[PDB]
Amino acid sequence: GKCRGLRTARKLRSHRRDQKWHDKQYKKAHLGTALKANPFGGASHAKGIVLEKVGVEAKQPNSAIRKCVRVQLIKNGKKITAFVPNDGCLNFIEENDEVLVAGFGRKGHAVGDIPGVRFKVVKVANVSLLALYKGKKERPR
Amino acid sequence: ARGPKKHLKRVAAPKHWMLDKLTSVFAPRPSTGPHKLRECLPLIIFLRNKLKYALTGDEVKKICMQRFIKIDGKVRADITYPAGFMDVISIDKTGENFRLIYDTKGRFAVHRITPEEAKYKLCKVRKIFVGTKGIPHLVTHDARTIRYPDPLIKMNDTIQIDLETGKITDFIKFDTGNLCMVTGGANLGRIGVITNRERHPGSFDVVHVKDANGNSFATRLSNIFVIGKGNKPWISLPRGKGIRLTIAEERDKRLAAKQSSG
C-alpha cells in the first residue's frame, strides 16, 4: 500500500474497490454486459437446431477446412458456429437436428486454428458424438 | 409465525437434555409450566433417557397414565411436563424419590434422595408483591404465588416449602458466606460460598463465588441460588459436589479409577 495510516481503512478499501474495475477478469464477471452478450446466457451447455453445415478456413499457418455447424439455439434463438470435434463426424449431422453444444475450453474465446468459433458439438439428437464415433451407439432413424 | 410454535426440532433442543442426533426430526417440546423451555427437563426425557424405565415415548404415556409419577407432591400425567431445578420426582410404586440438581456439567443428573428429604424442597424467590388488601406475596422460581410470607424474606432469598401443605418452614437470606448453586451460564452446576456482591445500577449485578478448593469465579445474580447458611447445605449433593475438577484433573481421576479397578 501507499497510505499506512492507522485510520486509513476507508481510503485503503474504497481505493481497492475503484481499481478492481481495471482488472479484466473481475469487470467481465461483475458487469451484466458479458453475461447478457453470452449466447449460452451463463450456462455450461445449450441445445440448438442445426440449420446449415459450414466449412471454416483454419486461421492460417496450418491450412485445413474445419467442419463446423451454424446452430440456432432454443433458449435465445441466437446463431452460433459450433465445431464438430472428431474426424469425419459431420456425416453424423443432418439439417434440422437438435445438437447439445458446449464451450471449446477458453471460456468464450476462439481456440487455435478456427477463427470466430467458441463452441463444440457434444450430442446429436440425444446421442453422444463419441458413441457415434467409436460405434457403441447407432443414430436413431 | 402468526401464532405460538407447538414443535421443537431435535437439533434446536437445549444441549443439557443430551438428546442424540439421529433418532427423530423433533424433540419433546416442553408444555408451558413452572420452569422455562431451556431451563427445564421434560418428564419423558427424565423417564426414558436418564432412567431408561421406558424404551419409546408411548411407554412413557403408559407409565404416566397409571399415575405412578408425582412431581413436587402432585401427580402429573403430561409426558412433556417441565420438571426443573429443585423439583422432587416421586416414583411411588418403585418407592424412589429424585431431586433435579445440576451435575458439575450443565445437565440435570439422577440424584436419588430419601423419602424424608423428598417431603420438602428449596425455592428461590423472584419478586415480593403487595396484593389487593395489603397482602404480601412471594413468587418463586417455579411460579408458586405464596401469600403471607415472613417479612424478612426479600428477592434472591431461598425459602424451604413443605410439598404436602405448600407453606414455608425455613429460609436462607442472600448474604455473604452462604452456599450458592449456580443455575445459569458457563458455571451451571458449580457450588461455592458467596464471597462478594458487586452492584450495577441499571445493568446486571455480578456475584463472585469462592469454591471448596479456592476456585473463585463470577456469575450474574439472576443465575444464582443459595442452598444453605454458611457451609452446610439444606439438600443432599451429587458426587463432584459442584467443585468442577478441570479436564486435566477429570482425565487423571477417570484414568486412576479405571486402572485401579480393573
Binding site: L6, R7, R10, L12, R13 | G202
Partner: protein
C-alpha cells in the same frame, strides 16, 4: 411567560386549584447517580418529555456525544464519532451517527460543542429515543 399553546400547559400530578384561606412543582431523581439540576426544581417550565419533570423513565443504555445543532424546539441533534475496525486492512475508519435527542429546558445555557450525556427511554417522537441527562461544557469556553 409560558402557556402559549391553545391547550393549557401544566404538570399532570400536582393539583393547583385547592381552596385558599406559588404553585408546588413535581420533580424526581432520575437514578444512575445523575443529579437533578436546580433549574428543574426552582424553574417554572412544563415539559412532558423532561426526564426530571415529565412522564419518561431512563432505562437500558446511557450514551454520550457532542451537541452539533440546536435549531429544533425542545430537542437537539448530537453527533457520536467512533472508529469501525475493517480487519482486512488491519485499521480503523472514522464513522459518525448523528441522533435527534430531547433537550429539557432546565438546561438553559447549552452551546454547540458541549459534550452531552443521553439516556435511552421510550420513543418521544419518530426519530427521538434519548433524553439529555447532563451537559458538560466544551474544552475551555469559561467565557
Amino acid at each position: 411567560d409560558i402557556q402559549t399553546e391553545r391547550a393549557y400547559q401544566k404538570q399532570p400530578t400536582i393539583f393547583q386549584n385547592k381552596k385558599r384561606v406559588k404553585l408546588p412543582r413535581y420533580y424526581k431523581n432520575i437514578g444512575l447517580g445523575f443529579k437533578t439540576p436546580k433549574e428543574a426544581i426552582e424553574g417554572t417550565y412544563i415539559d412532558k418529555k423532561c426526564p426530571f419533570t415529565g412522564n419518561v423513565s431512563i432505562r437500558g443504555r446511557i450514551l454520550s456525544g457532542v451537541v452539533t445543532k440546536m435549531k429544533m424546539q425542545r430537542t437537539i441533534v448530537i453527533r457520536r464519532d467512533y472508529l469501525h475496525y475493517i480487519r482486512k486492512y488491519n485499521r480503523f475508519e472514522k464513522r459518525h451517527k448523528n441522533m435527534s435527542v430531547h433537550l429539557s429546558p432546565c438546561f438553559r445555557d447549552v452551546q454547540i460543542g458541549d459534550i452531552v450525556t443521553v439516556g435511552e427511554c421510550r420513543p418521544l417522537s419518530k426519530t427521538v429515543r434519548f433524553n439529555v441527562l447532563k451537559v458538560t461544557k466544551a474544552a475551555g469556553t469559561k467565557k
